[PDB]
Symmetry: D2
Subunit: 387 residues, 4 copies
Amino acid sequence: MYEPKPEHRFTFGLWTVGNVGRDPFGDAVRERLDPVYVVHKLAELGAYGVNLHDEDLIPRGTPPQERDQIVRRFKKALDETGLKVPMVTANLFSDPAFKDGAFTSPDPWVRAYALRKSLETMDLGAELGAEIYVVWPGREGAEVEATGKARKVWDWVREALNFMAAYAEDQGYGYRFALEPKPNEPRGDIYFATVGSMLAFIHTLDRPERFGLNPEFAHETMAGLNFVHAVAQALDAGKLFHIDLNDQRMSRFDQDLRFGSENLKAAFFLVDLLESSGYQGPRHFDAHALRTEDEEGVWAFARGCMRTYLILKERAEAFREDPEVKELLAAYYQEDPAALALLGPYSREKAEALKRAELPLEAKRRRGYALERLDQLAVEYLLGVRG
Amino acid sequence: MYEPKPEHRFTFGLWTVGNVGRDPFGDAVRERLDPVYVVHKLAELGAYGVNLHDEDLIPRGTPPQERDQIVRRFKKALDETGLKVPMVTANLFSDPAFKDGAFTSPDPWVRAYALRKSLETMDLGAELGAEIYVVWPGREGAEVEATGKARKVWDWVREALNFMAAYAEDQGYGYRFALEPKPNEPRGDIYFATVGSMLAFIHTLDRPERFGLNPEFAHETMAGLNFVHAVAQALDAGKLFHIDLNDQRMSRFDQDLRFGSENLKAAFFLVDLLESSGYQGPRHFDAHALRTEDEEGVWAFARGCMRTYLILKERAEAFREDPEVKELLAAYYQEDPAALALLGPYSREKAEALKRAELPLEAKRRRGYALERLDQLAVEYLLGVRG
Amino acid sequence: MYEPKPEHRFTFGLWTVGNVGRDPFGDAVRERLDPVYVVHKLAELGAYGVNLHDEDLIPRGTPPQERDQIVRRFKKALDETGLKVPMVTANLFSDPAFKDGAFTSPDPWVRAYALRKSLETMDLGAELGAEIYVVWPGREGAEVEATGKARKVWDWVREALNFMAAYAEDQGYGYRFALEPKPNEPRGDIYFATVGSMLAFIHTLDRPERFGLNPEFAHETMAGLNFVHAVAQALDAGKLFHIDLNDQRMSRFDQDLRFGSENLKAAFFLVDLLESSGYQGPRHFDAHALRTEDEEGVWAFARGCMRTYLILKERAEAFREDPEVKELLAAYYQEDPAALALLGPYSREKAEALKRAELPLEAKRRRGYALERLDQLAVEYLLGVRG
Amino acid sequence: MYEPKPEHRFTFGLWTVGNVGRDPFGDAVRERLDPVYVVHKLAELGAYGVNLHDEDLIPRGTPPQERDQIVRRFKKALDETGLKVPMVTANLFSDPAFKDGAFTSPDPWVRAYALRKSLETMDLGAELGAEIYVVWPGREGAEVEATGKARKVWDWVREALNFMAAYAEDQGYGYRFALEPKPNEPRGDIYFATVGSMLAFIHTLDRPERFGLNPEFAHETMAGLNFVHAVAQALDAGKLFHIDLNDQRMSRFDQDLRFGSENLKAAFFLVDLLESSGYQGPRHFDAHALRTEDEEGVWAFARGCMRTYLILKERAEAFREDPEVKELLAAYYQEDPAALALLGPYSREKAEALKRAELPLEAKRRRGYALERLDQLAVEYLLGVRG
C-alpha cells in the first residue's frame, strides 16, 4: 500500500535522476539522459512533476530558434504524460562568470548577467506552467573577508529580488519565490546560510508576500542544525513555499542521499510535521543515486524516496493515535487555568498579580516529564514493534 | 599603547571572571569571589561596566529585606568606582523548574515563573541603571520531538516577550531587548539557533523596534557558521544591540575562550567590522579563564581580552590605509556606468534593455579577482610583517 | 520477547543511572541514589553487572576503615543479587589536582597521584571480582599548545600504563586494560582522540597483549566519525575488550543518549557487527536519562537501552536471512578465480602476469553495485515493513 | 628575508598549481597547464620539487610509445631546472572502475587493476628518481553498511600494500610508503579516517619499516580534530615520512586553502613542531588557488604558501627564545626529584613507596599553570607586537 499517487505531489528535478555521477575526484559513471526520456520514466514511476534549471533543458549559447524547438518537444512530453513542472530556477553557479558570486559579484556586468539569466528562466517557466521559482545562492559567499563585501551583499541581493518580483508583476506571472539557504559549498561560507537568515531577509523586500522558503534537509544538517525546528519556524511564519527532501550525515560535503536513508527518526518527525500542518506544496527529492549505481539503481533510488515517505506518513498517523501516546501527551501538556490567568496580553493588574502569586515551585522542580518513555515509544513505532 | 579606556566600552559579566572553574567532569578549582570585590578589580583593570544575572547578585530565595541590602552595597561600589551596569538578564536556566524550558515549558506555572523572574530582573536592572536586557534561551530546546512542541514554542516566546516589552513601557523603563541565539547546549538543540532565527522572530513581535540581537562569537562558531557574516546581517538590519566576544574551536561544547586566542583572522575582521560600522554598544567579553588558572590567571585573562581587541583595532586601521590594499580593492569594486544603468529599480524599459544588452561575458569569465594576493596581504598585516 | 537475560551481558555504571541531572548551566534535578539500592534495581531490571569508578563507591578522603565497611556492604548486595562487577576505573578527572592532566600533568607529584589512585582502584576491583580496567583520559588534553607538551605526553602515558600492567602481573590480578578514546571535552582537544590513536599507542607498550579498546558510540560520533568502521578496526585487531553503547547527535557536547534513540540505522549495524563477530564482552550502556526525567524516567531509560538492543539484534538476524538480501550480496561479492589468481602473496611471476593480464575494464566501469536497492531493503527491515 | 631556498624542501604537486578550478557546481575557470611549463615556473618560484599522479603526466590509455616520449620530455625539464620529483602516487580515484573502492572494491578484477596501476606508478617514479610513494585511499569507504564490507577491507588493503612493498624490494626500488588518511569525501566515510587509524594499520603489515604517514592539515581539520596532536603522534612513532600543508575551516568539504590563511595559530605551532623535531622530509603544499583567481593568482597562491611558512618559522624561533616565555615554561615543567623517584620502571618497592608517600595534594589543587599568560604571549608574538 505504498504506491505513489499524484495527490502526493512528489517531484524530481531533471538534475536529480539525471545526475551522471561525476564528483570532484571522479569521472562520470553514468550516461547523460534525454529530458523527454526522464519525463516518461518519472511519469511511469508515479511522480507528480519534474523541475528544472534553465541549463537542464537548454544549454548555454543555444540559438533562440533551437531553444523553442526544445521547449515544444519538452511540452509535448508533458502533455502526453500529464506531468507538471511546478518549479524552475536559473542556474547561477556553473558559468565561470559567476566565480565570485552571481547577485553578489562585485562586477555590475555580472550582476546584470545574473539578473538577465533569471528573467529568462522566469519566461521559460511561464511557458511550462511553473508556479514556484527557487533561488539557490550557491555562489553568493566568500572565503576572503578582506574585501569587506559582507557589508554590501544585502543591498545587492535585495535589488535583484525586488527587480525579479516587479518583473513578474508586470508580466502577469503568478510566481511565488522560494529562497533556498545553504551554509557552505561551493563557497567556503554562503552568506545566506540558514532558514532564519532567509526569513529575516524576506522581511526587508518590497513585496515580502511573494517570497517564502525552500528548506533542504541536507543543507541544515550539513551545519549540524535541526531541520525539524527550522521547518517549524518556516511554517509558523507561513513561508514554507517548497521543500527539498533528502538525507545527509552532519558536518561534511552535501551528500544528497535518498530520503530517510540515514536519519530515520528525523525523517519520521519531518513527515509528521508536513502532513499534520496541511502543507500543500511539492515534496521535492533534491537528491541523486549513489555513484556506485547504474541506471537501474537510479530508478531504485527514485522509487525508494517516495516509498519511504509513504511508509513514514502511515506510521506517523498510527503513532499519533496510540492510546498510551495520547495519555502521555495529555499529561505533558496539562494546563492549570489558574496559571493561564497570569499569562496572555499585558495588563499591569496581571503584572501585579503575577509578581505576588503563590507559584507551586517545589512541585515543578520535581516534575518528571516522562519524555524517555515517550521517546522509546516513538522508536518502537519506527521499528514497527508497536501497532 | 594598548591600555583600555572607558570609551572602549569593554564590559564583563560577574559570571565571567567570577567563574569558579567547575565543569561537568570536575570540581571547582577557584574560590567564589565577592561582587563588590570584582567591581573594584574590573575598575582597576580599565573595564567600562559589569553585567549580571539576577542570581549573580541575589541568590534564589533571598528575603526581600536582605535583597535590598545587597543591591545598595553593590550600588555603593559602582558609585565609588564609576563602573556602569549596561546589561542585565534573568537566569532562566539553573533552577530545576526550567528542566524542559522556561518560556517554552509545557507547564504554564513554569512559563509564569519564567515571566515573573524576568519582570523582577527588569526591576533590579532599572535600580542599577541598566539599559540593555539580554534573553539567552538556554533551556528552550528539545531532545525529544515526539511531543510536537516545536509547533507551539513560537507563540509562547512571542507572548512572554510582548509582555516584557509592554511591562517596560508601562513602568517607564528604557530597555532595548537583545536576544542571544545559541545552536545547542545544554539542550540537544536550542530552538532559536542562529542570528537569523532571532531576526526573523523579532519581526513577529508587537514592538519590534525595542528588540535586537546579542550575537556571541562562540555560539555561531560552535555550529561552524561564519560570525562575521551573521554580524553583518545584524548590522544591516540595524539590530546589533550588544555583542559577546570570545573564541571557540568549531563543532564542540561552548569553550568561552579568551577573545582572539584561537581564530585571529576572524577576530581581526570582526573588530574591523564593528569599528568601521560605528557600533556604539558594549564590547562584552562573555568568556572565562582556563580551568588551569588560579585567580592571577583570571586577571591575565581579563587583561588579554581587552589588549587583543585593541591590537586588532589598530592593525585593522593600518590595513585599510595600505596603498596596495586600496589599489587592489579599487580594481575589485570597479563599476561600469553602462552596467549600472541596467540595474536598480524595475522599469520594463530596463527589463527590455537588459534582455538585449551586449554583455562582456568572455572578459568576465576570464577575470581574476586577485583575492589570493589580497588575502596574503591581510595575513602579513596580522603577522605584523607589513607596516 | 525482548526481556533482558544475563547471557546478554548488559551492564550499567553506577554513574549512569545514578546521574543526578546536573549540567554546566543547571542544578541537579534528581536525588543521589544509594549504591546498594541501584544494585537491587539493576538486578530487578535484568542487568548482568554494574561498573564503578573508585569515587562512585568511596568518596575522596574516606578513612580506610570506613572504606572497608563500604566495600563489604556493597559486596553483600552483589552476593544477594548475583550481579557481577565486570569493570572498574579510577576517576582521574574530578579532583582539581588533575586540572592540567592526570597522567599528562607536567607536575610529577600529580602524575604520581594519578598512578597511585589507579593502583588503589585496581586493588578495589580485585576485591569485587572485576576483570576489565578502563582508562578514560578525560583530562589528558590541551587548549594551549605553546607549552610544547604534545611532544611529551606519549612517553608519560606509556610509563603510567606499563607501571599499571606490571603491577597487575606482580599482584596476580587478571585484568585486561581497555583504553577509551574521546576527541574533546572537558579539554579543548584530548590527545588520544580516536580508536586508531589508542590502537597505535597499544603497540608501543611493553605488554601489548594486556591492552585493548573501550570505544564509545558517542565519542566517535561527536567528531562526526563512523563508529561501525572504528569498531570493525578494533575487532580486526582483536582488541575489542569492552564497548560503551549510547547515542549522540554529531558535532557537539557528549549527550550520552539512550542507545538507538537518535541513530537507528547505525545502531542496527553496530549490533549486527557485534553479534556476528562473536564479541563476548559486556554491552555497557554508558549513558544517562534526560534531565527532564524523575527517577521513574531513569528506569524507563535503563529498560529502553536493553530493549532496543534486543529488538535490533532480532531484526539483524531476520535481515541477514532474507532471500533477496542473500541474492544481492552474492552478486555483490562475485569472485572470478581468474582474477583471484593475480592476487595474494607476492610472486614476481604474479607481478609480471598482472602487468600483462587482459583486465575487463569496460565491464567494470559500467557495473552497478545495486547498493541503493540493498540500502532501501535495510531501511524497510528497520521499519518492520519486511518480515 | 622570506625567500624560498632549496634546503627548505618546498614541493607542489602538478595537480596543485595545475588545478583548473572546476568544482561540483561549476565549470573550469582556468586553462590546463603544460607539465614542462609548471616545472619551469616552480623552479623560478624557488620550489625544491614537484610531485605527480600517474595521470597528471600520462593520461589513461596512452600507448606505451607516447608514454616514454612524455617521460623523457619531462625529465629534460627536470634536468634543465634542477627540480626533484620527491613523491609519486597512482590515481586510484578518477577511473569509474573505482566507483566502489580501488583496493577495497568487492570485485577482484578491480583490486587487480588498482594493484597494477600502482606497480606502474612505482616504475614511473623510479625513472624520475622519486623516493616516497603516497597512498591516498580516496575511494576506500562506504555509504552503505548493509554489505558488511567493513569486516573485509583490512585484509584487502594489507594484501595490496604487502604486495607493493615486496615488489619494490624485488625491483631494488628504495621507496618509503606514506599513507594519507582522510575522514570523508568523496566517500560518505573513508575507512582509514585518521592518522591513528593508519598508524595502527602499519603495525599489521609485513614490512612495517617501509611504511609511514602523510598527514594533511585539512584532512584532520575537516573532522574537527587537532592536527598538531596527530603529527606529534606520528613523530613520536618515527613515521612522519611526508606532510601535506594547507588550510581548512572545520566540518565541511576539503577546501585546500593556501597554508596559514585561516588558522594562523595552528599553523604557527605546526611549523614550530616540524622545525624543532628535525623533520627532514618535503614540505608539500597540497592545495590550490581560489576559484576566483586567474593564472597570476595561482602564482600568488604558490608564493604565499612558502612565504607564510618562512615568516612563521622565524617567528617561532623568536618566541622560543623570549626570556619571559623561558621563565614561564621552566616553572611549568618544574620537576621535584622526590616525585621523580616514585615514577619510572616498575619496582614493587616503588609501588609500595608510592602507595604510602606524603603527596602535596593541597598545593597541587591550588596551583595555577599560568597558561592564559603564556597563550597571550604566543598571540602577541604572532601579531608581531613582541620582538
